Design a protein around this ligand. Structure first.
Ligand SMILES: [Mg+2]
Lengths: 4, 179
């Protein structure tokens, strides 16, 4: 993901 | 060298707070949702996907106030192509003096860690607000836990923390209170  | 340049002068005397993005200030996902506060296009291998972001309750008051009290810094394990647009849309008041993303964390034992030593501040005047205790395993004494947030529109934990931070903002040494 580009998120955590 | 360090991740941050020297604090600019009105901030020298201020505690630096490192604030986390995901599950702390917002919660995002690729699953559409009608009430997203933000929609962000993110390109992954040449395809644009949509990220839907919700703002945690009272996030606006929180950042405005924290932005006056502290030298606030965004530190996230998310990638900039997502976090930078969110920070742009979320931070109307310029609370964030700087932004740090996945490449600035240390990858250790599975996790992306926020290694506060790498900031280049004096750690007696540093705090990390982060919903995941794994993020600050190198410095758990500098931490202000905060519950993970997803979509509870009754959440008040950002409002309710401001009084603690107001008094924290005054002390000479944060360990003096978090021991
Ligand atoms: Mg997070």
């Amino acid at each position: 993901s580009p998120t955590x | 060298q360090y991740l941050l340049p020297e604090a600019k002068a009105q901030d020298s005397d201020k505690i630096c707070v490192v604030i986390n993005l995901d599950e702390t200030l917002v919660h995002s996902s690729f699953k559409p949702v009608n009430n997203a506060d933000f929609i962000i296009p993110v390109e992954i291998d040449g395809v644009v996907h949509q990220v839907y972001v919700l703002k945690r309750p009272h996030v606006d008051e929180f950042l405005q106030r924290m932005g006056e009290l502290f030298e606030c810094v965004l530190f996230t394990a998310s990638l900039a192509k997502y976090a930078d647009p969110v920070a742009d849309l979320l931070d109307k008041w310029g609370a964030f003096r700087a932004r740090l993303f996945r490449e600035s964390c240390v990858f250790h034992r599975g996790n992306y860690v926020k290694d506060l030593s790498r900031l280049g501040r004096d750690l007696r005047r540093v705090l990390i607000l982060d919903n995941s205790p794994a993020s600050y395993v190198f410095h758990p004494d500098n931490a202000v836990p905060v519950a993970s947030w997803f979509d509870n529109m009754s959440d008040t934990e950002l409002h309710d923390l401001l009084p603690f931070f107001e008094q924290l903002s005054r002390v000479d040494d944060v360990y003096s209170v978090l021991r």
